[PDB]
Structures are given as C-alpha cells and as structure tokens.
Paper text:
Xanthophyllomyces dendrorhous β-fructofuranosidase (Xd-[name], EC 3.2.1.26) is a highly glycosylated dimeric enzyme that belongs to CAZy family GH32 and hydrolyzes sucrose and various fructooligosaccharides (FOS) and fructans releasing fructose. It also catalyzes the synthesis of short-chain FOS, in which the fructosyl moiety is transferred to the sucrose skeleton. Then, crystals from the inactivated pXd-[name]-[name] enzyme were used for soaking experiments into β-D-fructose and the different polyphenols tested, to get the corresponding ternary intermediate complexes. All the polyphenolic compounds are bound by stacking their aromatic rings against Trp105, with additional hydrogen bonds from their OH groups to several residues at the active site directly or through several well-ordered water molecules that are linked to the protein.
For catechol, we detected a small peak in the ELSD chromatogram but it was not appreciable in the UV detector, indicating that the transfructosylation (if it occurs) was not significant. In the ternary complexes with catechol and HQ, a molecule of ethylene glycol from the cryoprotectant solution was also found at the active site. With respect to the crystals containing catechol, the OH linked to the Fru O2 is interacting with the ethylenglycol trapped in the crystals, which in turn is linked to the catalytic Glu303 and to Glu334, through a net of water molecules. The other OH of catechol is linked to a water molecule at the same plane that the aromatic ring, increasing the stacking interface to Trp105. As can be seen, the positions of catechol and the EGCG diphenolic part of benzopirane are very similar, while the aromatic ring of p-nitrophenol is slightly shifted towards the diethylenglycol trapped in the catechol containing crystals. In contrast, catechol/EGCG binding position is shifted from subsite +1 therefore tolerating binding of sucrose donor to a higher extent. In contrast, catechol, HQ, and EGCG bind at the inulin-type subsite +2, occupying the same position that the terminal glucose from 1-kestose. As it is observed, HQ and catechol are similarly located in both ternary complexes, while HQ is shifted in the fructose-free HQ-soaked crystals. A possible explanation is that the higher mobility of HQ allows the second step of the mechanism to proceed, while catechol remains fixed at its position blocking a putative productive motion of the acceptor substrate. Furthermore, the structural superimposition of these complexes with the reported complex of pXd-[name]-[name] with sucrose can explain the molecular basis of the partial inhibition observed in sucrose hydrolysis by catechol and EGCG, whose hydrolysis rate is 50–65% referred to the control.
Residue numbers in the entry:
A (entry chain A), B (entry chain A): 42 to 665
C-alpha cells in the first residue's frame, strides 16, 4: 500500500485498517472520533447554554450495529469536546432485553424525570425490523432515560409494568416502522386541543410523534400527548398527524413520500426563527420535517423532506396536519435531520452526511464512516415584491404565494435554512480571507477560471452572487477540489432550474460514487428587475462538499480526489457570450476554517474489530 | 384471606403476594432470599476453604426468566451468607447480545483467566430454545467470566472474534440442546488421550462436556478439551462422550434416557470419595451424572440419573464412555444435580428441589419457588459378602457384581450418596436429640405409632434401622408432618422392593400435588444373615421431605399441610404379625435442625413484579 498522493493511486484495497484515516477526513465539523456514525439524536441546549449532541454510533466498526448514543458538547456549535466515561464517548448503549438490538434515535424532555433532562428513545429488541419486512409489535418500543450529570451518563427506568418501555402498543396494525420519538412542547397544539381534552383525558404539556407507516398504504406520523403534566410514563395516542400515500409524490420540487417515515419532527417558525405563539402570530407557519424511504432509486433510497402544514382538529380530539406545500431539506447524500430549540427563539437543524462508498470497498481503510452536516437555523423565508411573470410561480410547489391587493406583486413564503452564525463567524475569523474582484463572464470567459487566491488544503469555504439575464441559457458556478486531473463541478443552469454537482472527474479512485447530484432552485424574479440572482455558498471539508443557495436550497455530497494538489477552486462558465453575460460579485474565499475537535489528535482510530461468526448467527448486525 | 391454621384452609388464592412466605418455607437448607430459583451453578471451594454456591435465579418473580446467577457462601455447607452487591444477591445477569436471553448453568475453572476463578457458562440469545422446538445455532453459546473478588462480582470477556462467546459452533447438526458446560480436570482422560494428541492438537489440562442431543435420535454428551494449557479461549471438540437412544431405558432401576441431556457432569470416585488417579487405582470408577428430559410422564418430564462408565479411546483421539450400569440420583421432585471437588478427596453433589404446585396456583402467595437438596458426598459404595441368593442380584441394574473365587459370595459396587458430615454434625448439635427405644412391630402394632418424643415444628430429622425377614410381606416406615387430619406416609415394601411416599392426605389444600412417589431399593442380603435391613433417614424442612436409604437411594418430595399441629411423626406398620416381625432399632429424632441463613429475617420477600405486556411480545419469559 503506497500512500504517495503525487502519483496515481494503487490498489488501495490492499491498505491496512485506518491507513486512510486522515486522507479524506473532515476537520471543521461534527464527526465521531472513529468508526461508524449515522443519525443525530438527543439534541438539547443544556442549562449552561452549551449544546449537547448525540449520534447513532458503532465504535471500532465501519458498518451499523449495536447502535448506541455517542455524545459531545459545544458552546458555539463549532468547536466540540467528546464525553469520556466508562464506555469512552458512548453514553447510552444496548443493555436490556427491550433495547439489546439497538438504542435507536431519541429526543429530549428538558424537564423530565425528577426535573432532569430525559431522553425518550426507540428501544429495539429481536425480530424482523424494517419497512420491507414483516415486523411485529415489541421489536420497536419507546423507553426513557434521564441524566443527573448533564449528559455524561444516563439512567434508564427499570424494565417492567409501569416502567420501560413506556410506549409499546402499535396504534394501528401492520406497521412498516415505529420509531424516532420526537418530543416537543406546542402552545399551538395545546390551544387547538383545549376543547377536546374531555374526549381523550390527555392534558400534558408535551407531545410526541412516532415515525412509521402501514404496509401497502404509505407513511404515517403518529401523534401522542403526555397524559398528565409532570408525569412521563403515560402517553396517549391521539391519531395520525401526517398520512401520505404509497410512494406518493407532491411533484418535482418535493421528492417522494416513499413507504415509511423516519426521524420526523414538528416545529413552528416565523421569519425570525422559532415561533412559540398559539396561532395568534399570522406570520408563523407549522412545519414537519421527515425522512422517507423506498421512494428513491438512489441516495440509499432516502429523501430528507419537509412540509408546511395546516392543522385541523378531528372529532376524536386528534390533529390532522394537512400538507400546504412540500419541499426537500437537502438534495444530496444526507438524511436523518433533527431539529431542536435554542435560546433566542431559534430552531436549529442538523443531519447526517453518509459516505459515497456504498459497496464498502475502502471503509475499513478509512477506519470511520459518516459526519454531520453543518448546524442550520430554520426560519420562514419571505421574498417580497415577486414578479407574477416568474416562471412556474403559481405551481406553489415548495412555497406559497400571496397576491398583493392589486395583483401586480406576490409575497413568496417557504422554509429558510442558513448555517448558524456562530459557525460562519468562527470559520471566517480562523481562516485566511480573500475578497476577490467581481467578474463578468462573457465571450472571453474560459470554461474554468481559477480564483486569484487559491486554497492551501481541503478545508475552505467560498461564496458568490451570480446575476443572470431573465432569458439566459448560460450556466455558471464553482469548481472545487481541483487539479488538472481531478475536480468537482457545481453548476447552476437557470433555463432548467437545476443546480448540479458533476462528479465524473472528482477522483482517480473509481470505487467512490461519481453520479451527478441535482437540486431544483426557483429564482424568484423581483418586480422591476432585469436580472435574477443566485447566491451560492460552498463548504469544502475533507471529502464533504456542502452547498447552500439563497438560504433555501441545500445539497451535501462527497468527493475523494487522490492527488495532494486537487484542492484548487474557481469559476465555471458555459455558453456565456457578449450578449448572454453572467455577472459574478460578492466573491470571497475562506481558507482553513476551524479545527472542530481541538482536543483530538489527527488520528483517533482505535483499530477495527470483527464480532466473529456469531454475527451471522444472530443476523442483526453485519459484524464489522 | 385468613391465615388461621387451627381451622380448615379457606380460598388461599385470595391471599396477597408473599402472605404465605413463612408458612411452608424451608429453614435448614440452601434457598434464595425470595422469588424463583432453579439449578445450582458455579460451585467451587474458594481459596479460604469456604464454598461458593451459585444458582439460577429470577428475583421478585415466581416463574423462570431473565435467568441469572444468585450466589452465597458457607464455611460448612450448612450456614450461609448472601452476597450483596449492586444487583443484590445476583452476581451474573443477562447483559450482552450473546447472553441477553439468560445466563444459564456454568461451572468453574479454579485457575482461569489471569489466574482467577473463571466460569464457563451457557450464554443464551434469541430464537426457539428447547429439545422439542427447532433450535438454531447461536441461540445457545458458551462464554467466560472471571472474578477478582472471590465471587462478589464477575467480569465477562468482551463480545467478539477471539473473545466471547468462546464455544458457538454446533458439533453436530439438528441439536436438541447445547448447554451446561461442565469443566473438569482428569488425569484419567489425559492418560487415555496422551498417545492421540498429534491427531487433535488438544493438550490442555481441562476438559469440558456440553449437554444436549440430536433430534429424533436421543441424548448426547459432547466432550471438548482445552486446546492449550493456560489458555481459555480455544476448546477443541473431540467427540460424543455419551450417546443414548431416543427414549431408551436401561430398565426399572435406571429411569429413562429421554431425548436430551441437561446439567451433565463427569467424575471419578473410589470408596473414600473422589479419585484423582490415572486409571491405576483398581477400586476407582468413572461416573457421569446427568438430567434427561421427555422420558417421564410426570416429575416435569425430568429424570436425574447417573451411570458408571468404561472409557474407550477412538481412532480420532476422542473418548467413548460406555455405560456399565445406570441408576437414579434422586427418585422425587429434584433435578439439575451438580457436583464439584472439595478438599480431602471429596466430590460433593447438590440439586434443586422444585415445588409441587405445577399449575402455579399458590406461587404468588408463597412469594418464592424452589430450594436446594442437601449437599451430598459421592463415593463408591461397596457391599462385601453379599449372598448369591439375593433376588435379582445378577440383573446388575444400577450396580456391578464381582464373584468371589469360590462363587459363594459377591462384592456389590454402586454409587454411594450421603449427606455431608458437616451438615449432620451441625443439625445434631443444634437440635433437641431424642434417642428412642427399639421396637418390634408384630401382631400388636398399630398402623401408626407416634414416637415417644414429638417434633415441635416442621424442622426435624429422623433415622431408623428396619430389620425384615428374608421372605417378609410386611411393610414399615415413617409417618411425618402428621396430625389426625393431615400426614405423609413413607413406606418400604421389601416384597416389591418399593420405597413409596403416599401423599393422599399430606394436605387439606387440594391444589398441591398428591401423587405417590416411588423409588426402587435393593436390599443386598449378606451371607449367613437370616434378615435384611433398611437404614432409612428422613429430613423434614418446611415443605421438603428428603429421604435417604442405605447411603444409596435418595428421594426428595414436598408436603404442604395447612394445620399448625401437622408436625408429628412415628412408625408405620402394615401386615406385621407374630410370625412376620419388623425389628426397628437405632431410632433417633433431631428436633430443630439449624437456621441455615442466620443473617436473614424470617420474611425476605421484596414483593413481586410483572414485566408488563412486552413479556408476551418478546415471548421469552412468562413475565411474572
Ligand atoms: C435482568 O436482570 C438485570 C440485573 O438485575 C436487570 O437490570 C437491572 O434492573 C434493575 C431494576 O430496574 C436496575 O436497578 C435500578 O438501578 C437504578 C440505578 O441504575 C444506575 O446505577 C446502577 C448502580 O450503580 C452502582 O453500582 C455500579 C456497579 O458497581 C457502579 O458503576 C455505580 O457507580 C454505582 O456504585 C455505587 O453504588 C453501589 C451499590 O449500589 C456500590 O457498590 C458502589 O461502591 C458505589 O457506591 C448501575 O448498575 C446502573 O448501570 C446499568 O444501567 C445503565 C442504564 O441505566 C447502563 O448504562 C449500565 O451499563 C448498566 O446496565 C445505572 O448506572 C436505580 O436508580 C433504580 O432504583 C430506583 O427505582 C426503583 C423503582 O423502579 C426504586 O425501587 C428505587 O427506590 C429507585 O427509585 C427511587 O430513586 C429514583 C432516582 O433517584 C427516583 O426517580 C424514584 O422516584 C425513587 O425515589 C424514591 O426515593 C427518594 C429518596 O431517596 C424519595 O424522595 C422519593 O419520594 C422516592 O420514594 C434501580 O435500583 C439495575 O440498574 C439493572 N442493572 C443492570 C446491570 O442492567 C434487568 O432489567 C433484568 N431484565 C429483565 C428482562 O427482567
Ligand atoms: C454494545 O456496546 C456495549 C457498550 O459499549 C458493549 O459492552 C461493553 O464492551 C466492552 C468491550 O468488551 C467492555 O469493556 C471491557 O470492560 C472490562 C471491565 O468490565 C468491568 O468494568 C467496567 C468498567 O467499570 C468501571 O465503570 C463502571 C461504570 O461506571 C463502574 O461500575 C466500575 O466501578 C468501574 O469504575 C471505575 O472506572 C471508571 C472508568 O472506566 C471510572 O469512571 C470510575 O470512577 C471508577 O474508577 C464495567 O462497566 C463492566 O460492567 C459491565 O459488564 C459486567 C460483566 O462484565 C456486567 O455485569 C455489568 O452489568 C456491565 O454490563 C465490568 O464490571 C475491561 O476489563 C475490558 O478491558 C480489557 O479487555 C480488552 C481486550 O478485550 C483490552 O483492550 C483491555 O486492555 C483490557 O485487557 C487487559 O486487562 C485484562 C484484565 O485486567 C487482562 O485480562 C488482559 O490481558 C489485558 O491486560 C493487559 O494490561 C496489563 C496491564 O494493565 C498487562 O499486564 C497485560 O500484559 C495486558 O497487556 C474492556 O474494557 C464493557 O465493559 C462493556 N460494557 C457494558 C456496559 O456492557 C457491548 O459488548 C456491545 N455489544 C455488541 C454486540 O457489540
Ligand atoms: C403481586 O404481584 C404481581 C406480580 O406477579 C404484581 O403485578 C401484577 O402481576 C399480575 C401477574 O401476576 C398482572 O396480571 C396480568 O394483568 C394483565 C392486565 O393488566 C391490566 O389490568 C390490570 C388490572 O386492573 C392493571 O393493574 C394493569 O396495570 C399495570 O400494568 C400496566 C401496563 O399494562 C401499567 O401501565 C400500570 O402502571 C400497571 O403496572 C393493566 O392495566 C392481564 O392481561 C394478565 O392476564 C393473564 O393472566 C390472567 C390470570 O392467569 C388470565 O385471566 C388472563 O387470561 C391472562 O392469562 C394468560 O395466560 C397465559 C400465560 O401468561 C397466556 O398464554 C394466555 O394467552 C393468557 O394471556 C394478568 O392478569 C397484573 O397486571 C400486575 N399488576 C400491576 C403491575 O399493578 C402485583 O402488583 C403485586 N401486588 C401488590 C399489591 O404488590
Ligand atoms: C482490520 O479490521 C478487521 C475488522 O473489520 C479485523 O478483524 C477481521 O475482520 C474481518 C472482517 O472485516 C474478518 O474477515 C472475515 O473472516 C471470516 C473467516 O475468518 C477466519 O479466517 C481468518 C483468516 O485467516 C482468521 O483470521 C479468523 O480468525 C479470527 O476469528 C476467529 C473466530 O472465528 C478467532 O478465534 C480468532 O482468534 C481470530 O480473531 C477466522 O479463523 C470470513 O468468513 C469472512 O468472509 C466474508 O467476507 C469476505 C470478504 O468480503 C468474503 O470473501 C466471504 O465470502 C464472506 O462474505 C460474506 O458477505 C456477506 C456479508 O457478511 C454474507 O451475506 C455472505 O454470505 C458472506 O458470508 C471475512 O473474511 C477477519 O476474520 C477478522 N480478523 C481477525 C479477527 O483477526 C482485523 O483484525 C483488523 N486488522 C488488524 C491488523 O488489526
Ligand atoms: C445400617 O446402619 C448400621 C449402623 O450404622 C450399619 O452397621 C454398621 O456397619 C459398620 C460398617 O461396616 C460397622 O463398623 C458397625 O459395626 C455396624 N454397626 C452396627 C451393626 O450396629 C449397617 O451396615 C447399615 N446397613 C445397611 C444395609 O446399610
Ligand atoms: C498536480 O499533481 C500531479 C501529479 O503529481 C501533476 O501531474 C500536476 O502537474 C500537479 N500540478 C498541478 C495540477 O498544478
Ligand atoms: C491510525 O491509528 C490506527 C490505530 O493505531 C493505526 O492502525 C493506523 O495505521 C493509523 N493511521 C494513520 C494514517 O496514521
Ligand atoms: C381518531 O380519528 C382518526 C381518523 O379516523 C383515526 O385515524 C385515529 O386512529 C383516531 N384515534 C383513536 C382511535 O385514538
Ligand atoms: C394572483 O395574481 C395573478 C397575477 O396578477 C393572477 O393571475 C391570479 O388570478 C391572482 N390570484 C388571485 C387569487 O387573485
Ligand atoms: C476561531 O474558532 C473558535 C472555535 O469555534 C472561535 O471560538 C474563535 O472565536 C474563532 N476565532 C476568531 C473569530 O478569531
Ligand atoms: C468581458 O469579461 C472580461 C473579464 O471580466 C472583461 O475584462 C471585459 O471587459 C468584458 N467585456 C465587456 C464588453 O464588458
Ligand atoms: C390439631 O388441630 C385440629 C384443628 O384445630 C384439631 O381438630 C385437632 O384435634 C388438633 N390436635 C391433634 C391432631 O392432636
Ligand atoms: C412479607 O413481606 C412482603 C414484602 O414486604 C409482604 O408483602 C408480605 O405480606 C410479607 N409476608 C408475611 C407473611 O409477613
Ligand atoms: C470422532 O469419531 C466419532 C465416532 O465416529 C464422531 O462421532 C466424532 O464426531 C469424531 N470427532 C470429530 C469429527 O471431531
Ligand atoms: C457368579 O456366582 C454365581 C453363584 O455362584 C454363579 O451362578 C455365576 O455363574 C458366577 N459367575 C461367574 C462369572 O463365575
Ligand atoms: C450449630 O450449627 C452451626 C452452623 O452450621 C455450627 O457451626 C455449630 O457447630 C452447630 N452447633 C453445635 C454443633 O453445637
Ligand atoms: C410385640 O411387640 C410389642 C411392642 O414392641 C412387645 O411389647 C411384645 O413383647 C412383642 N411380642 C413378642 C412376642 O416379642
Ligand atoms: C413396585 O414398583 C413397580 C415400578 O417399578 C411397579 O410396577 C409395581 O406395581 C410396584 N408394586 C407395588 C406392590 O407397589
Ligand atoms: O440507527 C437507526 C436510526 O437511523 C434511522 O434509521 C435513520 O436513518 C432512524 O430511523 C433510526 O432511529
Ligand atoms: O435455567 C436454565 C438451566 O436449567 C436447566 O434447564 C436444568 O433444568 C439447565 O439445562 C439450564 O442451564
């Protein structure tokens, strides 16, 4: 195994375990110390203002199994410190008959058992488990644990009647899934249900959704309400909150609802961030975020979606969330988005970016799999003075429109997402910042124009505002992780409304994915404007490429160039002419970002292990 | 619920949990503090000379489940002290994917991992488990744990390749069972295999048997040998040690071999006790003790058996234990006998006495189920100068015969069992001892004759020597736990060779078992004698009646009389006449015995719990 990155890669499958640990590894984001990670979980702001982040974790392995909560904390979403206890960085693990098959996703009751932060999580036991299998009741249940030391450790309630698991009865038969309890307070839902509490007897101040579906009949989000305030054992099933059809799609801008939901959450937002009103704020909108499975031919059959909803109260004292419009939270290789409340009326969302090595060819050589996305503030994005001639505006696909009184302008509303400002400030302050001169891409533009200042490594950010003619057929964007022989091209094509990431040349290593990523982006044209603008921001972090457009569209992907000099960046131009000009301004490069794990050495591998021949006998985990 | 024991019992099923805790409870023997217990396990003599005894335990329940090792220690087999740790009196419990379904029986390697006492135990996981079910490989495996604090706690080896479980591959297909590893040293087997170690490469000083069988083709005891001395991960399968046929019986004196073995062990004995020679001691005999299942219509389909064996070395470097003669370790409501070595060339055996409430009618009201037998020294019983006219002598059923040179006398050899002398000494010393006058049972004998001194409670022992004519048709024995209305009759009938316990009047409470117990007893007639003698000893301990005859035959049973005065005892006589006289001598009553758990209060119930609706969903444990 040669690690010479000045020549073509050899047969890297001959390399030992974790020999490629640092080669492609993100440095500026949340990632486990080593091994397998997937979904964020147990997210909460602690009493001291710091953020506790959990994650689905399988240390010393590179496939899923014995799934546990790994955890860490941060005062700024950006620089993190691992917990370190008797199980290393794990804080909850399989240990009881009810959760021995895995401690799945869970969420936080901030004032729970004996006043302590309390997690409600999916406790899994034996049996077929999956949306395409014949799962039975008991295999997935919901259980409680609480922490007396701010997340350093958790104490589970005892196993038994009136204790764990606390939710085990399936609310409907033939479920495709029954997991990922999302606990939340909602003045909105309390106000809506206040006249029906005699029907259900559920009067608690916490609600919980559980994600699943029904075999042959689409996904379901099930709503529960805490039966009594200050008591956490009894949760009353109200009814289905979200019901979608088997592989139903709301359209091209909205992914596909698949057969089963995962990691669903409920929030309420206004233009500033989180909204805690009862319905009285006319600018606030109710949202559900959710993953779907088996409604996609690629991306591990997974869509991370969101929908704006209008709540209706049913006669039996339950809530129907009627979908008003429906979108995509991230168009790339990410899934399992979780959101949580943060001080200052914020709702912050973070997901999991998987690798692009689906045949598991170099996973052992990495010695790890997975990272988080960046942490994102959610809010209601409002665009005023939108021109009615904006193409496709009244499809109202992943947005709503409200006409002005005179019908000559429109107010557009949709889900906004932006990187938390703490991370942007820390990144900028720790980076070498180059402000670049604006450029007109015209007849003289090369296909690729390197920036006047170049990155020094695979840890950087770039931004630019691309101004297009209203009838342009030109394409423009950014090339990143670029040498002569390897590069990744991020294009926007206003005529098709497609943002693409072309990865045919991303790496000389052929075992990594090289399919083109695609997001839809609606450029809302402004009344009186003779152009339309795309604000495009890209974070490059080891192998992660994380793209944001107009504080609305997000696309996370992976590129694994071998060569040490495949770090360059610049502007892309196609079909720009003297008449069809793309103006690029507000150009800036941040080289370096932040070391997100300052206490960790460069190599935190502890080696990899095999579970042995019993892994195949039990049939639960791959075993490596 | 009335607890008035001076009048007839009411409907005792209306009584609360553990309200009958003290009513029928043994006081003078090993028993858990509360709840369910079954098989002894993890038996060893510690470095300080004390005895560590483990047991299959389910606290706060009255049926089997979450099965764990409860433990205690004693300096004299008789007075015990519970361990007390983070899990109360438990010291090993289900905690890993490989043992989450139960920590089954295991045995001790005295100098094991890092020189510490080490247990090899059956670690169970999910799936059908049972001799009549379709069990699969992995459901029962064998795992190691070691203790650094003399049994107060145990540390399991890690889960994985080259660690736990250490034995998982089935040695043959379609096993009925694969459990109860019995680890032992054997100079005998080492000497027999010494010329074959090139064939197998197994040269360790520990052997282990695993108990099971093959579907449709009878029971099997599988022999393993430690691959290398001082190393405890690798155990090499040699071959089947004992092979018996599907529901095969060696005859009337030998029970039935059933379909599957449980709790099998291997030992070597001589007339004094344990034998540690290599084969050179011509007085020593190799024995296997084992439980069988599904070869009996009653007694929970369970026979606790033993066999004398002659070892043959196979060409593949394995051992066939050929059965020479075959007997019964206890004829009553006991099972799961374990034996272990004790200083002074002793092998000590102890089993589990189950209740006689198979429909679980009063188990909750008890608040516990089960006890141990007394601890028994094993040895080779030798009877010299036996008359060849002893009826049925040359059937050689559960004994062997060796003729004298002149053919006029016989030496009989069989398995001897007697209560450990420490217990007999402690019982006698703490009791009020009444030595009773000898009696001739003749034409004037009443059916029942109370002893001149009577017990004061349900904790006593009695012994007597019954001398019969060689052609007697008289019956005699002992009545115990007796008032006018309730009593239990222990009869010997030399003409049929049957020792019986008639329990039709044992209790006014009709839900307890009342079937007649039966053991075969061979009175070996001595050359020149004009009579034959039965030495009969009975221990009465709460509800336990434990009977020993001629240091050979054992019969454990249960009687639950309601009335407070159903404690009396005396002699039974049937068909005694002027011509057919039974002489009774050596009569002695010990009233009181010993408080075996001096630190425990009278009521050690902690209440009972229900596992809740998930117990039925998981399908592993009853849940109560
Ligand atoms: C199969 O069998 C299994 C084994 O038996 C079984 O699992 C066990 O289940 C039981 C029962 O559910 C569990 O017992 C509970 O334990 C809770 C604490 O759990 C944490 O701590 C224990 C013990 O920790 C000590 O020991 C360990 C090991 O040595 C050390 O590491 C620790 O440092 C600590 O050591 C100190 O103490 C020792 C003595 O105990 C000393 O020896 C030592 O020197 C130290 O000083 C840990 O073992 C636990 O770890 C395990 O679990 C975690 C997850 O939780 C895993 O991550 C980990 O790997 C382990 O598996 C864990 O860390 C107790 O809190 C709990 O007791 C409460 O609940 C019951 C009711 O259900 C009450 O009876 C009891 O009174 C307690 O309730 C009171 O207190 C709580 C909290 O304060 C209140 O909320 C509650 O209202 C109540 O308050 C009352 O009192 C107040 C005043 O005090 C009053 O104001 C109130 O009004 C009120 O009256 C219970 O004991 C046990 O942990 C399980 N063990 C394991 C190993 O899993 C399994 O379920 C079985 N399976 C089946 C299918 O049946
Ligand atoms: C799913 O995930 C699960 C969770 O991750 C996973 O289970 C875990 O598996 C791991 C890996 O197998 C287990 O880790 C092992 O733990 C052994 C010790 O186990 C005992 O102690 C721990 C820790 O105890 C501390 O913390 C608890 C909890 O707070 C306290 O109660 C204790 O008092 C104690 O507290 C002190 O220390 C803390 C810090 O650690 C402090 O915070 C605290 O303040 C105190 O000071 C317990 O948690 C264990 O309890 C659990 O298990 C028992 C059964 O064992 C249950 O009954 C119980 O309920 C719990 O479930 C337990 O009591 C370690 O010995 C072991 O490390 C050895 O092995 C590995 C190799 O496999 C080596 O890397 C390592 O070096 C060690 O080997 C050396 O040492 C041994 C023994 O000394 C030697 O034999 C060996 O040769 C070697 O020697 C070397 O060094 C010598 C010099 O030192 C040298 O001379 C030699 O030459 C040689 O080089 C390992 O860490 C972990 O316990 C499991 N945890 C649980 C909760 O189950 C599960 O498997 C996963 N499932 C799947 C399917 O994957
Ligand atoms: C004395 O000890 C016991 C422990 O043994 C303590 O706990 C009780 O344990 C018994 C079992 O011994 C439980 O009985 C079972 O109850 C089931 C129905 O439960 C619901 O109703 C009761 C009655 O009002 C409620 O109290 C329960 O509430 C508790 O549980 C819920 C969770 O569901 C918690 O949220 C609460 O907080 C409580 O903890 C429940 O709401 C019932 O299904 C079950 O029925 C079987 O058994 C009976 C009798 O044999 C049959 O009539 C019936 O047909 C079922 O029989 C089954 O038999 C076989 C084998 O099981 C199966 O193959 C068959 O198909 C069939 O299903 C049973 O009655 C009791 O619920 C439980 N009580 C608790 C936890 O409070 C006592 O508390 C303790 N007493 C004291 C004072 O300490
Ligand atoms: C680098 O990290 C790894 C952890 O990932 C460490 O451990 C190794 O892990 C790999 C898996 O990643 C193990 O590979 C598997 O080995 C099986 C055969 O094992 C036996 O042979 C090897 C080779 O000589 C021995 O080393 C083993 O000894 C160890 O295990 C025994 C217990 O059996 C212990 O007692 C010892 O002490 C050792 O610990 C064994 O004797 C093999 O069956 C398995 O095969 C699958 O995978 C390969 C490749 O994909 C296929 O060719 C094959 O067809 C099988 O594919 C399966 O694929 C799917 C999904 O699994 C199934 O559905 C199919 O039906 C099919 O079965 C695999 O090759 C390796 O054994 C293990 N090594 C150990 C523990 O030593 C490394 O140690 C670590 N390296 C370092 C230097 O630290
Ligand atoms: C019944 O018990 C008696 C008394 O223990 C046994 O007779 C004794 O046997 C020993 C050992 O051979 C002798 O040393 C004693 O002299 C005998 N004592 C007597 C006759 O009082 C007798 O062997 C036992 N019988 C059976 C059939 O087990
Ligand atoms: C980058 O590295 C490759 C391989 O060493 C080399 O061919 C190329 O000229 C280097 N320089 C660039 C792309 O500027
Ligand atoms: C990282 O550390 C692991 C564990 O010690 C080691 O096996 C591996 O070779 C190291 N990799 C690198 C790139 O240093
Ligand atoms: C309430 O009504 C809805 C709509 O029919 C139904 O799906 C839900 O199950 C009901 N809730 C109950 C029965 O608790
Ligand atoms: C909204 O405005 C557009 C453009 O003027 C018009 O076509 C449409 O009918 C208006 N909708 C409503 C509800 O008035
Ligand atoms: C660099 O990043 C750290 C960690 O996030 C942050 O606290 C610090 O303020 C940053 N440095 C600046 C802004 O100069
Ligand atoms: C075309 O673009 C280049 C580079 O921005 C610029 O120098 C030139 O002035 C542009 N042409 C016109 C006509 O503006
Ligand atoms: C024993 O008790 C019962 C019921 O109280 C009584 O009838 C009998 O006379 C008592 N005395 C005996 C059997 O000596
Ligand atoms: C024994 O103690 C248990 C637990 O406190 C109690 O429920 C039961 O009534 C007691 N039984 C007796 C006979 O004292
Ligand atoms: C050794 O031979 C016996 C008799 O055929 C057989 O049952 C056993 O499995 C053999 N041992 C092996 C193959 O290890
Ligand atoms: C043993 O002795 C009996 C009685 O004398 C006789 O019938 C039998 O044949 C003898 N057995 C042998 C092997 O000599
Ligand atoms: C009573 O029993 C205890 C406990 O077994 C024992 O140590 C003691 O010696 C006995 N008392 C005597 C023989 O007087
Ligand atoms: C018959 O038995 C009684 C009681 O033991 C005794 O008094 C009497 O002497 C016996 N008869 C003969 C003839 O020995
Ligand atoms: C003695 O026991 C046997 C069972 O081994 C039985 O067949 C026989 O009928 C019994 N006879 C008497 C008289 O009890
Ligand atoms: O690791 C298991 C967890 O990951 C998910 O499948 C999302 O991909 C969740 O539904 C589950 O809780
Ligand atoms: O409790 C389970 C244990 O009990 C037995 O079944 C004996 O009755 C053993 O074979 C097993 O190890």
């Amino acid at each position: 195994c040669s690690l010479d990155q000045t020549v073509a890669p050899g047969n890297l499958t001959l390399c030992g375990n974790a020999t490629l640990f640092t080669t492609f590894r993100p440095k500026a984001r949340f990632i486990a110390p080593e091994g397998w990670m997937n979904a964020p979980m147990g997210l909460y702001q602690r009493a001291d203002g710091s953020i506790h982040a959990g994650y689905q974790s399988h240390p010393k392995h590179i496939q899923w199994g014995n799934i546990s909560q790994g955890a860490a904390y941060s005062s700024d979403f950006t620089s993190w410190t691992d917990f370190n206890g008797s199980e290393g960085y794990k804080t909850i693990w399989p240990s009881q008959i009810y959760d021995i098959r895995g401690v799945f996703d869970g969420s936080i009751i901030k004032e729970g058992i004996d006043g302590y932060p309390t997690i409600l999580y999916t406790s899994t036991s034996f049996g077929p488990l999956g949306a395409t299998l014949n799962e039975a009741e008991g295999t997935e249940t919901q259980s409680l644990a609480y922490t007396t030391d701010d997340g350093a450790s958790w104490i589970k309630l005892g196993y038994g009647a009136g204790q764990n698991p606390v939710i085990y009865e399936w609310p409907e038969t033939n479920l495709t899934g029954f997991r990922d309890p999302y606990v939340f307070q909602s003045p909105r839902l309390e106000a809506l249900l206040a006249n029906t509490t005699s029907i259900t007897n559920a009067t608690g101040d916490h609600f919980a959704t559980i994600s699943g579906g029904v075999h042959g009949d689409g996904a379901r989000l099930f709503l529960y309400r805490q039966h009594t305030t200050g008591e956490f054992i009894k949760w009353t099933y109200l009814g289905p909150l979200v019901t979608t059809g088997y592989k139903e799609s709301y359209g091209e801008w909205s992914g596909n609802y698949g057969i089963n939901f995962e990691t669903a959450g409920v929030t309420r937002l206004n233009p500033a961030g989180a909204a805690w009103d009862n319905g009285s704020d006319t600018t606030a909108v109710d949202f559900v975020t959710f993953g779907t499975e088996q409604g996609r031919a690629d991306h591990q059959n997974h869509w991370p979606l969101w929908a704006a909803v209008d709540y209706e109260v049913r006669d039996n004292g339950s809530i129907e969330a009627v979908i008003a419009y429906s979108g995509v939270q991230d168009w790339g290789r990410s899934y399992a988005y979780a959101s949580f409340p943060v001080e200052g009326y914020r709702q912050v969302s973070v997901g999991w970016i998987y690798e692009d090595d689906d045949n598991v060819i170099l996973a052992k050589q990495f010695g790890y799999q997975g990272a988080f996305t960046l942490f994102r503030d959610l809010f209601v994005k409002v665009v005023e003075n939108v021109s009615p001639s904006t193409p496709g505006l009244f499809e109202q696909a992943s947005w709503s429109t409200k006409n002005s009184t005179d019908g000559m302008s429109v107010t557009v509303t949709t889900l906004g997402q932006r990187v938390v400002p703490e991370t942007l400030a820390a990144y900028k302050g720790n980076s070498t910042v180059s402000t670049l001169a604006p450029v007109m891409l015209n007849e003289s533009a090369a296909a690729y124009t390197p920036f006047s200042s170049q990155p020094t490594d695979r840890f950087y950010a770039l931004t630019g505002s691309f101004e297009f003619g209203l009838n342009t057929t030109a394409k423009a964007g950014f090339r990143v992780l670029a040498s002569e022989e390897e590069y990744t091209d991020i294009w926007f094509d206003p005529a098709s409304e497609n943002l693409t990431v072309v990865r045919t040349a991303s790496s000389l290593i052929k075992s990594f994915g090289n399919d083109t990523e695609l997001a839809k982006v609606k450029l809302y044209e402004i009344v009186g404007a003779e152009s339309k603008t795309l604000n495009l921001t890209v974070f490059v972090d080891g192998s992660v490429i994380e793209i944001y457009a107009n504080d609305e569209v997000a696309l996370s992907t992976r590129a694994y160039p071998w060569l040490a000099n495949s770090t360059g960046a610049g502007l892309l131009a196609d079909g720009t002419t003297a008449g069809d000009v793309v103006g690029v301004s507000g150009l800036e490069l941040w080289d370096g970002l932040v070391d997100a794990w300052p206490a960790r050495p460069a190599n935190t591998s502890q080696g990899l292990v095999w579970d042995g021949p019993t892994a195949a006998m039990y049939g639960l985990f791959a075993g490596y």
